[model samples]
Target: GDIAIIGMAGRYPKAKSVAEFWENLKAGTDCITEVPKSRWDWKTYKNTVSKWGGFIDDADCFDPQFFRISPREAETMDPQERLFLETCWETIEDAGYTPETLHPIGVFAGVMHKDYSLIGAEQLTDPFPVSLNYAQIANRVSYYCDFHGPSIAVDTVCSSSLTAVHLAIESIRRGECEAALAGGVNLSLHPAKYLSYGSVGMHSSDGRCRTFGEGGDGYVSGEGVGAVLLKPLEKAEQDGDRIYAVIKGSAINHVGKVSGITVPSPAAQAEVIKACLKKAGISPRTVSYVEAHGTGTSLGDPIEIEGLSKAFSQGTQDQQFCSIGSVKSNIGHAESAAGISGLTKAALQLHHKTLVKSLHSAELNPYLKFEESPFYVQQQTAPWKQPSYPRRAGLSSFGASGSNAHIILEEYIQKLIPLSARNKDRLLAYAEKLARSLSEKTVLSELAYTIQTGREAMEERAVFLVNDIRDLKQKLNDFVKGNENIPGLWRGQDDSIRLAELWAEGKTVDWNKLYKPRKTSVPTYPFAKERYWI
Candidate 1:
C-alpha cells in the first residue's frame, strides 16, 4: 500500500522535456500557434482558418540510426512509439537505474489511436501487413527498454494515461513487479487524427486555447509523451531516492454508456473522485489542490467544475480554499498523455515547494464557477500555503469515451537527517548546477533548432526555451541597471557576454557546456550575439 514515485520524464508540444514543461507552466506561458500550412492543406477543410496546434519542433531528435531501426521500419513505426521510447529511457536514467536493473519493471501505457500517420500510405497500398497494426505500437517502448515484466496498453480516449497509472499500481499490488513504468503518449500530426477530431468540430477556431474563459470555443491539438517510475515505499526509501510525491491511491470507472460519445457526466466523474479518496483514506479537506482536467472546451470545463463541487463542496465547507489548475492552459491538451502531464506537473510543483499559475485565465467563466465550491484557478506564481496541514492534491483525468480516473498524491516529506557542512554545500551546488544546465540546454536547443530549420521549426522545438533565455538575459541587464524585472527574462539566461566573445573572436563555442546530448549534432549556424542582442 506504500506506493511512491521514484522517477519521471516526458516531452510535450513546445516542451522537449520536463524542465521546459515546468518552466512553461510556472511562467504561465502559452505554446499554441497557427498550424503550419506546409504539412497540410488547410484551405481544403471547411471552417478552417489558421487553426492552432501544439507540435514538437525537433522531429529529428530520435534518428532512425540511433535506434538501430531500419529505414523501412522507422518509416512504418508510429512516432508515438519513438517518443515513448525516448522518455522511457530518460525516466530510467533519471531514476539512476541501469538497463540491467530496469528488468522486471512493469510497463503500462495509455494510447488513443495508433499510427494515424500510416493511414495515408495504407490507402495507397493494395495490401497492408498485420505488422502495421496500432496495437503493436505499445511494444515499441517495452521492446527497446527491455522491460521484462507484464506489459499492457489501455485505450480509454483522454483518460488513457491516468488509467495506465492505475493499472501500474495494481501490478505492484499483485506482486507482478517491484517497480513499474507507466504513462501515455498522443500525437495528432497525421491527417487521420486531425480529420477525425475536425469532423466533430472539437478543434479551436481562432488558434488560441482559451480554457474556462467566456470566449472559449474549442481545444487545441497537442502531442506529448510522459512516463513515471513507481516503487513500493519501503524500497523507495531504501534507495535514498527523492520522492516527489506519494501516490496514495487511485480509481477508474466509466459513465455507463452515455447517449453520445462526447456527453458529459458529472455524476460519474464525482464517483471516481470519491472512490479514490476513500482508497487513499483521506477526506476532501486534506486536499490542498486539484489538478483539474481542464481541456479548454466550454461544455467539458464547466461539467468538470460542477462535478468537483458535487464531490467536495458539501464535506469541505471551504471549497474555495483548494487551488486548481490545468496544464492544458500552458501546453494545450496532450490527448492520451494529458493526464500524466498534469500529474507530472503537480509532482514537480510539490517537489519544488511552489505551484504553477494557469495562463490565459484572466477571469473565471461565469458558467464554470461553482458558487458553493471554493475551487479557484491559480493565476499567479506563489508558494503553496495551507493552514496547519501537510499539502496534498487530487489529479483528475477524463476521456472522451466515458472513462475517468482520479488520483491522490501527498507532498514529499524530507527527513531532518544531520548533514556535514561539506555535504550540504555539495547538495546545494548539485541542485543549482542541474537547474542551470537544464536551462542552458533548453536555450541552446531552441537556438540551434531555430537557426537550422527556420523560425517556425525552432518555435515548435523550443518556444519556451527560446523565449525564456531571451527574456532572462534582458531582465538580468535591467536588474543591474535597477529597473523593473523584464517579463520574458525569467525564461532565458544572460548569454550575451559569452555569445559576444565567440562572435568577436570568429570562433565557434562548444555547445556541450550548455546542452547535454546523448549524441552530438551541431547546428548549421553558429550562435551569434548580433542576431539576438539589441
Candidate 2:
C-alpha cells in the first residue's frame, strides 16, 4: 500500500460520532426509518414512493464562531457544506495535525445534489448571501483551512466519495499535495429530490436495504457526511500517525455503453476490481473480506457477485473464502456519501480486528449462488481471524452515472489518546468525551505522547500522569468533578508542578525528551454546537 488513512470522521443516521457508528454496525442496528417532518412534508406530494431514509440529527446546527463565519453567512450556507467543514476539520485533527502544521493539502469532495440551492433561493434576502455553488462544497474547506493543493468537487452519482479518495491519493502520489482530505456529504433537504428516484422506480418503498438478501429491491436514500486524511504510507509511518488502514491500490473506470446508461455492468466491475488488485500486487485469495457496493437491488446484487467471482476466479479457484457485506444494509444507501461509509466501516473492521454482522441477510439472494461463488455473506459479528498474513479487504462503489471505483484496503495496526480545549468547561467536557471513548487496550505512553504533540495547548489546562487507562479515566473523572487536588492530577504554571506547568506558562517543553514521541489515535476537538438556522 502506498497511501495510508491516518484519520477519519463522519456523521451517520442515529450515529452522531464515528465511535457510535461502529457500535451500531457491531450490533447490526438498522437505522432506516420513515421520513421525518423536519426534512420535508412528504404528504404534500402525490404519486410518490413511501418516504423512507436515514437522516442525520440537527443538520442545521453549527458554531459560526468556531469557523469565524458571521451568523448571516452561516445561515445562508448549505447544511451539507457546513457538515463537510466540520468533518474535514475533525479528519485533519484526527490525523494529529493542526491546520498550521500541514500545508499544501488537497481537498477533494464528492458532491452530487444541490438540493439546498432551491431552499436557499427561497430564503435569500440580501444580495450578498454566501456562495452556494456546488464546487464550494470542496472549495470552501480549502479556503477556510487555507489548503494550497487541488480542491475539487467530484460528481459521479453513488461512487463519488471513493472517486474523490482515488483522486486525492493520486494527487499525493504525483506530488501535487503533501497530504489530502477526501470524502463526501449528502443531505435530504427537499422532497422534490425524491421525485427523480420515484420516476425511475429506484426507491425501495419498504425503506429497507436488504443487501444480498431475499426480497431485495431498490435502495433507500440516506444521509451521511464523512472525511478521511491521507498521507503516503512511509510518511505516515515516519510521522508516527495512527493508521486505520492502508490504501493498497485503487482504480476507477466507466461502465461505457451498458444496456442502459445507469445500469450496473458486471464486466466493467470485474475489470476495475482486477485492475485494483493488480495495482496493489495482492492476490485475490489473500483478501479476507470485501465491503461490497451492494445496494440490495435484485438487479444490482446478482451482477455485483458475478463480477466479483469473475475477478477472483482469475486468481484463485477457492469458493466461499472471502466474507462479503455492505454498510448500506444497515444505514440505507447514503448515495453520494455511500462509498466513504463502506470504506470507513471496512477500516473500522480492520482496526478492531472484528467482522461486524451485515444486517438483513437472513435469506440470501438466490441469484448470488453463494455455494458456487468465492464469496459468502457475513451474517454475524465475529472475529476476523488473522493468520500469518495481514488482514486485507476490497471495496467497491459503482455510480449510476457510469463511473465505477474499487479500492483495496489492508489493515495497518496500532494507537494513543489525547485531550485539550480552549477553556475550563470545554477542556473538562473534552476530558469526559475522551474518558468515555477510551478503551482498556489503549497504550499509556502512546496516549501521553499523542496528547503532548497532537493537541495545541489552551489556557485552562490539566495533565494526567497515570499508570493505566483506568487510572487516567479516574483522574479525568476526578478533575471533571472538581477534584483536582488528587495525587496524579496537576495544575498551575508558575508554581511548577510539572512540564505541563512549563507548557501552560507559555514556555516550550521538549515532549520527545520525556515520551518516545509516538503519535496515536485521540479524540478530536469538541466543537461548540450552536444552531444557526435559515
Candidate 3:
C-alpha cells in the first residue's frame, strides 16, 4: 500500500496529450531540435554548439473563457502559471471526480525560477486577477480545484516536481489532505539562458542528451507541464480509482559537502536512494528499472550510476539485472518539471507493463563499467514481465542547486473504478437526467455504474428495471408523476428532492443537459481551452 497516482496530465515537446507523450517515449524519439523561430532566432544562436532543445511551441496559448478568466488577466499571467492551472484541472477531471464533489483536495506544484514572470510583470501594469508570482502557479490551481488544504509552489530547480510528489504523499499520510494534485512546469521562451549555458559549456554540443554515452557533453533545456492526482492506495482501491502506480517510498536530501556547490555528490545521491529503499522495505534486487537523473554530462551521468550502484551494492552483487535509462536523453532538462517527466513515464510504463527504450546513448559512458556495475543501459523497448515480486522502478532527480530526490514506484496490483457528469428529460424527456449529460455511447452499464456506485440514493426515488434504453426512457416518463407506490412504472415516497443540486439551492439556471457537457473521460474532454474541458 502506498500513494496511488490515480490520474495525470502532461504536455511535452512534440506531444500534445499524455497518451502522445507515452507513445513518443516508447518510440525513443528525440524531441530535442534546433530552436524554433517563435521562441527566438535560431540563427543568432545557431553558431552556438547544441543550438537544439525541447520546446512547447504553443506555450503562450490559453483559454480564459473556459476558466472564466478575463482576457486581460489571462494574457498577463505567466505561461507556467496558466499551464499548471490547466494541467491541475485536467488531472483532477481525468481522475473522474469533480472538485465540487471531492473534498480535502490539496495542490503542490512547481516552476523554474528563471521564468518570464519578471518580463511578464510589464504585461501586468494594470490590476491583476492574481499576482504573477511563483506562488500563484500553485495557488491558482488550488483555487480552481477548490482545494481546501495546503497548496505550495516548490522551487527545488530540477528536483522540484519529485519533491512535490514526495511532499504530497507525506501530506496525505499525515492526514493534512485526502488527495492532492502535484507536479511542475517549465517553458523556455527566449535564448538568453540557453545561450548562457551554451557559452559556459554546460549545454550539449550535439543538440542531444546522450546520457551515459560516449558523447556525454551536457544536456539540452526542455519545456512542458505535468500534473498527477494521488490518493492513498487503500482509499483509491476502496473508491475504485484507476491507479497508474504506487509510490512505495521517497527520500530527499542535499549535497551537504560535495566536491563543490555546483558539483554533485554520489555519496549523498546513494544515501537518498538507500533511504528510499529503507522506507519502502524493498530489496535493491527487486527493482528492474531506474529512471536516472542522467543529465548526459561528463560528471553528472557517471556520478548518478555510481550512486545507484553504491546503493544497490548493499543488497546484491548481481550485475546488470537492473536496467537503467533517462527521459532527459529524450526530452532534455525541464528544470523544475524534470522529475515528473521521469515519474510520469515510469508510472505509465508500469501501468502498461512495457519498458520503453531510452535514447541517445549509442556508446556507453566510459566512466561507468557495464559488466561491473549492477546496471545496464539497454536502449530498446522490451516487455517488462513481472518477477516473483511486483514490477518496480526507481526514479532519481538531481537539482543543479544540489537538492537531490529519489522515489521508488511499484505497479498497482489491483485496478480501481472511475471512480465525473448534466440533467434533462423535463421529468425525463431526455436520457440525460442527472448532474452530467449522457454520452453518445453511454450504455445501460455505464448509467448503472454511475447510479449504483457513483451516486448516492435520493430520499425518495423511482425504480425502473427496464430491459432497454427505450423501455427506460418510456418508463421514466410514466413514473414522472407517480404517487407513492403507484403501480408498475412508479414507486416512492413524496420527498421534496429538486431535479438538479442547483434547484435545491433555489438557483435554477440552465439545469438543461445541453447547457453543460457530460462528466467525461480522456476522449471527450481534451486539453485546455475552457468550456469545462480536460
Candidate 4:
C-alpha cells in the first residue's frame, strides 16, 4: 500500500526548481524579501506587521502556445492555474513520461482564495469570468493532459496540499486512479487580503518565520507552487523508477472544539500523528526527522511540539532522538502551499540523505519543552546518519481551518539520466546543465537506460554511452563544446547508429526491444517564456 514519490517539481522563493530548492535549503538561504512594488504598495498597508514575503519572480509569464492556450485566454487565467499547469508538466517529465503516456492519472491541487479573480475583476470586461473558479486549478491539468481520474481542488488553509496528498493516496488505494499528482500553489496578488490577517496579528513583525525560536511572534506569508508524481511502490519498483521516498502512511483529521476555531488542538494533532504511524506500522523511535508545522507563533509552536511529544511518547520514551525543522523558517509560511513545501523538503532530504538547517534557530523558544520531547531543532545542515532501519521522517501540516494532516515517509533504495529538449540550442544547454548536475555517485548504465526509455523522443537529441559519471560528463561537455564527432557520442540521430538515425527521422525505435525500460528524474524541457499578464 506504499506510495512512491517518483517525480517532483516546484517554484519557490529564490528557487525556480526542486533542485535549486534543495540547494537553498542546504545553504540555509532565507528567501523572504520585501513585498515587491509589482504586488502592491507595501507602505499603503500600514497596519500590517510584516512587509516582506517569499515571492517568486515573473508569475505573470507563461508560454501559452506550449499548452495550446491562446494568449487572450491566458490573460483571463489565474497565474496560480498557469503555474500549477507548468509544474505538473515538469513533474510528469521528471517522472520520465510525456503527458501523452499517462492517462487516468488524478490531479489533487491544494488552493485557497482566488486573489487573481479579484485582480481580474478590477479590469472586468469579459463576457464571463474565466479565472475565478478555484476548481479549474486542478481540473485544467486533467483537461489539458486528458486525464480521466478524479480531479479535486482542496482548500484546507495551510494543510491543503498535504490533505490533497492524503486524498490522492486514498484514490489510488481504492483503485480510483493508477497514479496521481498532488500539490499546492499560492500567490499573493492583492493587498486587501493581508488586512484580515493583520487584524489577527498573524503577520510577523520582523518579516521572518523563526519557528521554534524565541520571539516567535507570527508567521510571514510566502508564495510557492509545487507538485509531485506518485505511484504504487510495487509498480514503481517493477518499472525501475527513481523514487525519492515512499509514503508509508498518512492521515488527516479535524481539531474538534478547540479553544478557538483557528486555534490548534494538541490532542487532535497527537491523535492524527498516532493514527498515521499506526497506519504506517512503524514505531515512533524509528522516525529520525520530522518536518514540523512550526509556524513560529508563540502560542502555536509550543502546542505543536507538545502534540508531537505526546504522540511519540505513546510509542516510546525517547527524548531528542529525532530532528525536527520547518520549511517556514527558510521560506515563511506558504499558507495553502506550505504542506507540499515541507513534504518536498523532507522528500529531498531523504533522497539526498542529508538534513538541512532550519533558519533562525539560534534562539530557542522558552515555551517548547525540548528536554522532555523526542525531537530537537536541527540548527545546522548535516549528513543524515543511516541506522539499522531505513531512514524515516514525518511531515505535519495544520490548517487554520482546523484540518491537520500527517504523512510518514521512508527513504527508498535508488536511476539513469536522460536529456532532451525542443530545440538544438536548448538541447546543448540542457546537456551542460546535466553535466554539472551529475553527482559522483550516479550510475551510468541506469542513467542511459532511463533516457532511452523514460524520455519522450524529440527532434533534437544526443545519446551517450559512458563508463561512469566522469565519462558521461566529459562526453556531454565535449558535445556541448561543438565536438560532435567524439567517440561514444551520437547526435541528431545511432543499433545505436541505426536507431539514432531512425529516431531522428521521427520513427519510433521501440526502445523496449533494445533494453529493459527504467525511469529516472532528469531535467525537464525548458519552455520559452512569454509574458501573458493583463
Candidate 5:
C-alpha cells in the first residue's frame, strides 16, 4: 500500500479543460499553430521560425465570485492565478472532496516565471494594479480552498511541477496534511517567454517538435495548467477513492557545479533515480516503464538517455522491463506544467492498463539508437499478457534551474469498499458543487467580456459576435448535412443595423477604413548548414 492519486485535472492548448485534454491526448491531436495576430507581430521577428507555440485562448474563462474574490481583486489577479484556482477546484471536486472537508489540505504549486503575462502587459503600457503579488498566486488557492496547511509556490524553472510533487510526497510523509494538491501552470504569451529561450537557441525551427528523432531541433513553448490530488495510502484506501497508482518513492537533487545551469548533468540525474529506487527498497528490475523528460531538444534527449542507462545498469542488461516514452510527443512541452502532464498521463495509463503510442517518433534519431543504448522508447501499445504482476512506472522531470526529480509509482489492485451513506451524500454534493463552479466560470466569462467591451459598442463587439455566429453556423451545418441557411440567420443583422444607424445620423462609418486589413509576412528563422552534433 502507498500514496495514491485520487484525482487529476488539466487545461492545455485546444483543450479548455481536463476532459478535453484527455480527449485530445487519446485522439493524438496536435494543437501547435501560428501565433495569434492580436498578441504579436509575427513578421517582425526575422530570426524566428513560424512563431508557433501551444497557446490557450482563455481570455474570458474565469470566475471570481466562486472564490469569493471581489471584482477588483479578481481583475487584479494574474491570469495564471485565475486558471490555477479554477483547475484546483475541479480537481478537488473530481476527488469527491468539498472545500469544507479539505480545509486542512496542503497546496504545492510549481510555476516557472511568476506573473510574466501581467508583467508583459504592464511593459506594453497596459498596466493594471499590482495588488496581488506572485506568492499570492499560490497562496490564493489555499485561501480560496480553505486549506490551512502548508502552501508553497516553487519556481525551479521547468522542473517546478515535478519538484512540487516531490515536496507534496514529503509533506504527506510528515503528516502535514491529510491530502495535498500538486501541479504546475505556465503561460508563454509574452515576448520575454520566448525571447530568452530563443536567444539560447532552444526553440524548434522547423515548426515541428520532434523528440528523440534525427531531425529534432528544439522544444516549442506550451501553455497549460495541471493538478493532481494525492492522499496517504491508508487514508486513500479508507476513503474508497479510486486509486490510479501508488507512489513508491520520490527523489530530488541539484546538479551542483558539474554542468552549467542550462546543461543537464547525467551523473546527478542518474544518482537521483538510483536514490529513489533505494528509498523505495525496490530493485531497478521491478520498474517496467519510464515517462521520460523528452523536451524534443537535441542535447537534452541524449543526455537523459545516458542518465537512464547509467541508472538502470544495476538491473539485468537483457531485462525488458524498462521502456521510455514522453508525453511531449502528444502535447508540446508545457514548460512548468510539463511534469504534471506526464504524471497525469502515467496515472491514466496505470488506471487503464495501457500505454499510448508516441506519435511522430516512429524512427529514432540516428545519433541515438535505443537498442544500442540501454533503453527502448515505447512507440506503440502492446497487450499485457502477465496480469498477475503489478505494473510499475518511473517519472523523471528536469528543470532549467539545475534541479532534477524522479518518482516511482506502482499499480495497486484492490476492490474499494462501499462508501458510507454520509460519504455518498458528500460525494454527490461535491459533484453538484463542481457543476455550480463551472456554471460560475461561464457566467464570469460573459460578464468579463461585456465589461471589457461595452454592449453598446456595436463595432467593437462585432468581432466576437461574428466569431460566435460562425461557430454556431458550423455546429448547425454539422448537425444537418447540406441544409444551407440562406442569408445566414445573424449574418447581415449587426452590419446592416450599424450601417443604417450611422447613415441615419448623416455620418458614414467606412467599415474597411475603420478596420484596416493588413497583410503581414510570417516569421522565418535563420538556417545554419553546419551541424552542431558533428
Candidate 6:
C-alpha cells in the first residue's frame, strides 16, 4: 500500500540533476557560495544578512518553444513557475513515460516568494495578473503535462512541499490519480527577502548552516527546485518500474501554539513522528537514520532533538543508536521547497545505500547531550548497514509556523532481468493483435510504421515494413536466426542510446512526438536559458 518514487529531478546549488546532487552530498561538498551581481547589487543591497546564500546561476533562463509557450509569456513568467514546469517535464521523462503515453496524472507542488513578481513596480495598469496568481503554478503544470487529476498548490510555510507529497500519496491511495509528480520550487532572488528574515532573527549572520553544531544561530536561504515521480508500489512492481524508494507512511500536524506562532514545539513533533512510524508499522529502533529538520538554530535544533528522542523512547532508549543529519548544512534553507529538497536527498541515499555526511556538525549542541541521546551526527559518508530488515530512515520537516510533517521511507528490492523472455506466446499474441489492427488501417506502409513505433522492442527483435499481417509474421519467423536474410527484419539492442560515437551527445528531445513515444534516458527539459528579469 506504500507509494513508490520511481523518478526524480532536482536543480540545486552546485548541482543540476539528482545524481549530481548526490555526488556533492557524498563528497561532503559545501555548495554555499557568494551571491552574484545578476540577482542584486550585493555591495549596496544594504541588508545586515549572512555574507552569502545558496544560489542557482541560471534561474532566469527558459525554453518556451519546447512547451508551446510563447517567448513573451515565459519572459514575464515567474522563475519558480518556469523551473517547476521544467522539472516536472524532466521527472516524467526520467520514469520512461512520455507526456502523450501518460494520462490521468496529477501534480502537487509548493513555491516560495510567490509575490516576488518580475517587471517590478510601475505596473499598476499591466500588472501581469496571470503570472502573479500563485495557484497558476500547479494549474499550469497540469495544463502542460496533461495531468488531469487533483492538481494542487500548497503553502504551509516550509512544510508546503512535503505536505504536497503527502497529499499526492493520499490521492493515489484513494484512486484519485494513477500517477503523480510531487515537487517544490524556491528562489530568493530579491534582496528584501533576507533582510526580513534577519529582521526576524532567522537568518544566520555567516552564510554557513551549523545544524546541531556549536555557535549555531540559524540557516541561510537557498534557491532550487525538486520533483519526483510517484506511483502505487503494487502498480510500480507490475509495470516493471524503477523504484527509487518507498514512502511507507506520513503524518502531518500543527504544533498548537505553545507561546508564539513561529516557535517550535516538541510535543507535536514527537507525536507526529510516533503516529507516522505507527502508520508505517515499523519500530523506531529499526530506523538507523533520520534526516532531521535541523535548522541549526540554538532553540530549534535542540527542540528537534528532544522531539525525535521523545518519539524514539517508545521503541528504544539505547544511547546514540541512530544517526541524524540535515541537508540544510549543505545547501541553505529553501523555505517552501525545503522539505522536498531534504526528501530528494534522503531518497537518493536510500537508492545508493549510503548515509551522507552532515556539514558543520563538528561539535554537537550541548543541549542535545549527544552522550545520553539516541542519535549521533554522521560525520562521514558511509554504507548503510542494518541488522536484518531492509534499510529505513525518517525525514522530518517543520515550518516556522508549525506545519510539521514526518515520513518513513524504506528501500525497494529491484527484480533482475536477463537477456531472455519468460512468456513468448503472450508477447507475440499482442504483437500479432496490434499487427492485425494496423492492417485494418488499409495502408501497407502505415501498418509497418505503427508496429515499429508503437511497441516495446523485445529480445526477439524484428523490423517489418508491411500492411499485411502475413508479411509481418514471415519476417518474425525468418528472424529465428540472427540477422536473418529476410527483408524488413533486423536485430538491435533494446532502448539503447548510441550514435556512431557521435561527437555530440543526447539533447532535449520532443518525446511526445518521438517514434516510439518513450521518455528520454537523459535528464528532462534541458531548458535553454536567457536573462528574463526586470
Model 2 / residue 523 / CA error / Å? 1.7
Q: Look at candidate 4 and tell me the lDDT of residue 450.
A: 60
Clashing pairs in 2: none
333-394 per-residue lDDT for model 5 (tens digits) = 88888889889888877776777666667777877767755567777765433433678888
Clashes of 3: 12
TM-scores of the models, in the order given = 0.75, 0.93, 0.80, 0.93, 0.75, 0.80
- Write one digit per residue (lDDT tens) for candidate 2, span 263-306: 89999999999999999998999999999999989889999999
Q: Clashes in model 5: which pairs? A: none
In model 5, the runs with Cα more than 4 Å from the true position are 47-50, 115-128, 381-388, 415-534
lDDT of 1 by residue, 1-534 (tens): 958887788878777667677788777778876666644666566555436677776532454544567666655556677667767766765564545544677888888866444554555555543234545455666677677777888888888999999999989988889888899888765466677777787877765556666677778877788899898887777755547788988999899877797787999998998888889988898787889888877788888888887788546777478888888887788888888998999888787778888866787777775456768788898898854667888999888879999999988685000001112233233223333443444444433332222211111011111235445344334433545443322211127444433332334333334432111111111111111000
How far does residue 60 in candidate 4 sit from its true spot (Å)? Answer: 1.6
Candidates 1 and 6 compared by TM-score, better number: 6
Residue clash pairs of candidate 6 = 90-524
Candidate 4 has its poorest 10 consecutive residues by lDDT at: 414-423
Error of 2 at 520 (Å): 2.2
- For each candidate, the alpha-carbon lDDT, in order, equals 0.67, 0.84, 0.74, 0.86, 0.67, 0.75
